[PDB]
Scaffold this active site. Structure first.
Site, PDB file in Angstrom:
ATOM      1  N   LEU A 196       0.831  -1.198   0.000  1.00 35.03           N
ATOM      2  CA  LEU A 196       0.000   0.000   0.000  1.00 35.03           C
ATOM      3  C   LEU A 196       0.866   1.249   0.000  1.00 35.03           C
ATOM      4  O   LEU A 196       0.429   2.309  -0.436  1.00 35.03           O
ATOM      5  CB  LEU A 196      -0.846   0.015   1.241  1.00 35.03           C
ATOM      6  CG  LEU A 196      -2.006  -1.012   1.144  1.00 35.03           C
ATOM      7  CD1 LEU A 196      -2.843  -0.831   2.435  1.00 35.03           C
ATOM      8  CD2 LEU A 196      -2.826  -0.722  -0.093  1.00 35.03           C
ATOM      9  N   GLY A 197       2.082   1.112   0.449  1.00 32.40           N
ATOM     10  CA  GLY A 197       2.839   2.296   0.764  1.00 32.40           C
ATOM     11  C   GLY A 197       4.238   1.864   1.098  1.00 32.40           C
ATOM     12  O   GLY A 197       4.504   0.732   1.526  1.00 32.40           O
ATOM     13  N   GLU A 198       5.125   2.826   0.930  1.00 23.64           N
ATOM     14  CA  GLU A 198       6.547   2.734   1.264  1.00 23.64           C
ATOM     15  C   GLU A 198       6.820   3.579   2.512  1.00 23.64           C
ATOM     16  O   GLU A 198       6.272   4.689   2.701  1.00 23.64           O
ATOM     17  CB  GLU A 198       7.417   3.171   0.027  1.00 23.64           C
ATOM     18  CG  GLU A 198       7.160   2.160  -1.170  1.00 23.64           C
ATOM     19  CD  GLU A 198       7.741   0.697  -0.971  1.00 23.64           C
ATOM     20  OE1 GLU A 198       8.474   0.342   0.006  1.00 23.64           O
ATOM     21  OE2 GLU A 198       7.447  -0.143  -1.827  1.00 23.64           O
ATOM     22  N   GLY A 199       7.692   3.089   3.378  1.00 22.60           N
ATOM     23  CA  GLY A 199       8.085   3.855   4.551  1.00 22.60           C
ATOM     24  C   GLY A 199       9.593   4.098   4.477  1.00 22.60           C
ATOM     25  O   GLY A 199      10.318   3.400   3.724  1.00 22.60           O
ATOM     26  N   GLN A 200      10.099   5.013   5.308  1.00 21.92           N
ATOM     27  CA  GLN A 200      11.574   5.111   5.339  1.00 21.92           C
ATOM     28  C   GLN A 200      12.214   3.830   5.891  1.00 21.92           C
ATOM     29  O   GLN A 200      13.371   3.432   5.524  1.00 21.92           O
ATOM     30  CB  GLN A 200      11.964   6.360   6.192  1.00 21.92           C
ATOM     31  CG  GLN A 200      13.385   6.626   6.147  1.00 21.92           C
ATOM     32  CD  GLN A 200      13.852   7.777   6.982  1.00 21.92           C
ATOM     33  OE1 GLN A 200      13.098   8.368   7.786  1.00 21.92           O
ATOM     34  NE2 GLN A 200      15.096   8.150   6.781  1.00 21.92           N
ATOM     35  N   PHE A 201      11.442   3.088   6.708  1.00 19.13           N
ATOM     36  CA  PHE A 201      12.000   2.005   7.513  1.00 19.13           C
ATOM     37  C   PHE A 201      11.186   0.722   7.343  1.00 19.13           C
ATOM     38  O   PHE A 201      11.399  -0.296   8.045  1.00 19.13           O
ATOM     39  CB  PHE A 201      12.028   2.451   8.970  1.00 19.13           C
ATOM     40  CG  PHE A 201      13.030   3.541   9.213  1.00 19.13           C
ATOM     41  CD1 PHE A 201      14.354   3.381   8.725  1.00 19.13           C
ATOM     42  CD2 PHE A 201      12.684   4.708   9.922  1.00 19.13           C
ATOM     43  CE1 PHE A 201      15.320   4.373   8.958  1.00 19.13           C
ATOM     44  CE2 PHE A 201      13.701   5.692  10.184  1.00 19.13           C
ATOM     45  CZ  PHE A 201      14.981   5.501   9.676  1.00 19.13           C
ATOM     46  N   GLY A 202      10.307   0.708   6.356  1.00 15.76           N
ATOM     47  CA  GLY A 202       9.481  -0.474   6.236  1.00 15.76           C
ATOM     48  C   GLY A 202       8.401  -0.149   5.259  1.00 15.76           C
ATOM     49  O   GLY A 202       8.619   0.655   4.351  1.00 15.76           O
ATOM     50  N   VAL A 249       3.925  -0.602   4.355  1.00 16.72           N
ATOM     51  CA  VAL A 249       2.567  -0.808   4.792  1.00 16.72           C
ATOM     52  C   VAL A 249       2.008  -1.781   3.769  1.00 16.72           C
ATOM     53  O   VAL A 249       2.119  -1.570   2.564  1.00 16.72           O
ATOM     54  CB  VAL A 249       1.760   0.502   4.878  1.00 16.72           C
ATOM     55  CG1 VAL A 249       0.363   0.123   5.339  1.00 16.72           C
ATOM     56  CG2 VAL A 249       2.512   1.496   5.890  1.00 16.72           C
ATOM     57  N   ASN A 284      -3.773  13.424   5.895  1.00 19.88           N
ATOM     58  CA  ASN A 284      -3.614  12.510   7.027  1.00 19.88           C
ATOM     59  C   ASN A 284      -4.945  11.957   7.516  1.00 19.88           C
ATOM     60  O   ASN A 284      -4.936  11.178   8.465  1.00 19.88           O
ATOM     61  CB  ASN A 284      -2.889  13.223   8.200  1.00 19.88           C
ATOM     62  CG  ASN A 284      -1.361  13.192   8.037  1.00 19.88           C
ATOM     63  OD1 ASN A 284      -0.866  12.202   7.463  1.00 19.88           O
ATOM     64  ND2 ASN A 284      -0.683  14.185   8.447  1.00 19.88           N
ATOM     65  N   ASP A 292      -0.087  17.700  12.912  1.00 23.23           N
ATOM     66  CA  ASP A 292       0.007  17.608  11.418  1.00 23.23           C
ATOM     67  C   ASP A 292      -1.376  17.260  10.824  1.00 23.23           C
ATOM     68  O   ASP A 292      -1.548  16.430   9.928  1.00 23.23           O
ATOM     69  CB  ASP A 292       1.112  16.632  10.941  1.00 23.23           C
ATOM     70  CG  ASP A 292       1.405  16.750   9.402  1.00 23.23           C
ATOM     71  OD1 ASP A 292       1.030  17.768   8.759  1.00 23.23           O
ATOM     72  OD2 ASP A 292       2.063  15.751   8.827  1.00 23.23           O
TER      73      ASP A 292
END
Ligand SMILES: CCS(=O)(=O)c1ccc(Cl)cc1CNC(=O)c1cc(OC(F)(F)F)cc(N2CCNCC2)c1
Length: 293
Positions: free
Chosen positions: A14-20, A22, A152, A147
């Site tokens: 679903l998504g890219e993270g800096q550290f993993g 989703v 969000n 934020d």
């Protein structure tokens, strides 16, 4: 106790993270787990799983464990829910409901206002009221979001809205943050003047950001706040709020927005933080108008 990792079945990223990452996952035989899953027997149960890389650094694991601790407190129909975690082995996992219509900015961007996919004015108010009710709950916890914006917020079935926090992890919204080397990354166009000048973030500055999020909703997400002004001009405008010489400027009234509702937005952008309305009054106003228009 941990959610059974063996029941999570990968479907797509679903998504890219800096550290993993989703992942969208199915839950095998979920009636067994019923963990407050929303299970229609014999229908796929889809969840979003935020997952830390198996080679994750100490810094990244610490930040994930703190995000587990924060999110574990949050229990409200308009706030992201932790359905469970897998923290006793790698990868560390946190599991939440899959919100099948994505983030609210993307969702509204795909709609136009109904003309006497479309969305009606009362449903835009209902979306905004859900956001104000989730923020009302966070204010009761003395939780400051810092934020709030439509990128969000998440959209489920039947126009259900939940507030979440993607953590500034997305190219799509990179221009909504002001970046200076060695400083915190700042969503300046949603920040109250005292946040920009002072770093002072409070429930009163979350009310100012809610005013800007309400503006976005009534713009159907067609425009960045202050989008004709540079970042430096947005910062200079915070300065004009402090100086209080009558040169500060505000977001303009959206085409869809009546003057009364615009005046509500303007109150959220009061120079004095104590003149901004509480989320319990914002919710009331928008829900009444949602119910009666
Ligand atoms: C949907 C966004 S995601 O990134 O795909 C994803 C998917 C599944 C899971 Cl479990 C989690 C996430 C990401 N974390 C959140 O959403 C979230 C929600 C939060 O509560 C809310 F502030 F009230 F919003 C707060 C936080 N904190 C972490 C960042 N510092 C502040 C506390 C994260």
């Amino acid at each position: 106790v941990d959610f059974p990792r063996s029941r999570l079945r990968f479907k797509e990223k679903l998504g890219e993270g800096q550290f993993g990452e989703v992942h969208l996952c199915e839950v095998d035989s979920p009636q067994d787990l019923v963990f407050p899953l929303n299970v229609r027997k014999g229908h796929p149960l889809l969840v979003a799983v935020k997952i830390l890389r198996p080679d994750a650094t100490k810094n990244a694991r610490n930040d994930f464990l703190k995000e587990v601790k924060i999110m574990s407190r949050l229990k409200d129909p308009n706030i992201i829910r932790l359905l469970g975690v897998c923290v006793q082995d790698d990868p560390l996992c946190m599991i939440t409901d899959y919100m099948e219509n994505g983030d609210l900015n993307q969702f509204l961007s795909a709609h136009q206002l109904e003309d006497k996919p479309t969305i009606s004015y009362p449903m835009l108010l209902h979306v905004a009221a859900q956001i104000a009710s989730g923020m009302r709950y966070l204010a009761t916890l003395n939780f400051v979001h810092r934020d709030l914006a439509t990128r969000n917020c998440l959209v489920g079935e039947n126009f259900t809205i939940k507030i979440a926090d993607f953590g500034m992890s997305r190219n799509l919204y990179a221009g909504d943050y002001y970046r200076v080397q060695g400083r915190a990354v700042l969503p300046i166009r949603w920040m109250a003047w005292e946040c920009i000048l002072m770093g002072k973030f409070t429930t009163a500055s979350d009310v100012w950001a809610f005013g800007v999020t309400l503006w976005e909703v009534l713009m159907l997400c067609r425009a960045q706040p202050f989008g004709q002004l540079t970042d430096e001009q947005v910062i200079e405008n915070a300065g004009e709020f402090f100086r209080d010489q009558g040169r500060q400027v505000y977001l303009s009234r959206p085409p869809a927005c009546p003057q009364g509702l615009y005046e509500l937005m303007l109150r959220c952008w009061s120079r004095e933080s104590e003149q901004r309305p509480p989320f319990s009054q914002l919710h009331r106003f928008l829900a009444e108008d949602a119910l009666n228009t």
